Curated annotation (Swiss-Prot), chains A, B, D, E:
It comes from the Viruses. Residues 1-56 are annotated as: Oligomerization. This is Terminase small subunit. It comes from Bacillus phage SF6 (Bacteriophage SF6). The terminase small subunit specifically recognizes the non-adjacent pacL and pacR packaging subsites and regulates the ATPase activity of the terminase large subunit. The terminase lies at a unique vertex of the procapsid and is composed of two subunits, a small terminase subunit involved in viral DNA recognition (packaging 'pac' sequence), and a large terminase subunit possessing endonucleolytic and ATPase activities. Both terminase subunits heterooligomerize and are docked on the portal protein to form the packaging machine. Homononamer. Interacts with the terminase large subunit gp2; the active complex is probably composed of a one monomer of gp2 and two or more nonamers of gp1. Transmembrane segments: none annotated. Signal peptide: none annotated. Belongs to the SPP1-like small terminase family.
Length: 56, 56, 58, 56, 56, 58, 57, 57, 57
């Protein structure tokens, strides 16, 4: 049960901040039906990542 | 009786942060009907786990 | 029980059940045409991460 | 007029935390119509009750 | 005309926590139409009242 | 010209009106088929409790 | 260098908001999923924040 | 070479926002599930946030 | 072992955001519940968060 170390944490946040990452969400396909799909990680999230990298 | 220990907490946080995990959500299947489904844990929740991990 | 108070360890055991994915919550699910029904879902990733946080501060 | 004291506050939070409480919500009954009903208090709200009991 | 002092505040918060209060919300009545009505105060709000009472 | 600045007791008078359930806010309300109108409803519980909290702190 | 609001001008603005004077632009339904831009009174929540800022001043 | 917005510059921008000079792109309903991009004034909550930050300067 | 953004890199990225040079991907209604992916300007809320941080630096 490995544990992510502080520098591996800064790496993962860097990828997010650099627009490199995606998240799964629900997307309308029509008449109420939805499908799973991947979208870029949002501005809000990318900013939080940027905030943390700055506190490093 | 079980109380998750501090190291075990980091382990669990690590599995989330590394995109290994899912949550149960509702998804539309047509005309107002929904199904229970599993999706990846969001960027938002991953970044929080990542934040907690960098403060350890 | 009308004056039962959860003690510190009880709180941590309860958070541990949440954190470990052993708990549910009652939500409203759509069953067609605007109609909803009560159902139980796994506690969310967000709520589990709060429990984890809390267990990590202990 | 009554003022809840600390011990009563913790008793009330305890029932919440233990999943013994309900809240009134709006539930869809068809074609935009809704009705009042009671649901279990949410995980979020329970978890806040625990955090508060953890701090006493 | 009036300013609430701290003990009056607690009195009002107590009513809320004890579940003696309501709030006005919009409820659907069908075909997009909504109607004003009252519901019990939510658990989130009741918990906040509790939190303040226990910190008094 | 000197513009108005709410003074200490005036803020408390306003929060008190809110807390007491004397005030309203403007919101959009469905009237049929996706169309909405503007109306007033009572300030909500969350907002009243925030007013109360600020009153307690003063 | 441009225009920067001073500490007083901030309070003046906040007071107009707290006093129910201001509005904000929102989207309103006009039917069948279609919406239009309209203005509405600044909300209770936003007025309470303003009151707060004025209270801490 | 690359730009870093300095403290004074930030206050100028926040001031434009607090005054009601700025807008944001949002999705608006146009009927039957269709939305379109359009601009609206920056909301009250966001303006009050700019006001808070300027107030603390 | 892998790339980590340094402080000035962070400020540069935040500056792009505050300045309204950046977008985000979202889902938009195209009809009858159908959605498609598309890019929108970064919202005011987020631009003000970037502004705040820059002010802090």
């Amino acid at each position: 049960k490995k544990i992510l170390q502080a520098n591996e944490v800064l790496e993962h946040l860097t990828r997010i901040a650099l627009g490199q990452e995606k998240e799964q969400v629900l997307m309308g396909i029509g008449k109420g039906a939805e499908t799973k799909t991947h979208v870029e990680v949002s501005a809000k999230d990318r900013i939080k990542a940027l905030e943390l990298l700055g506190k490093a």
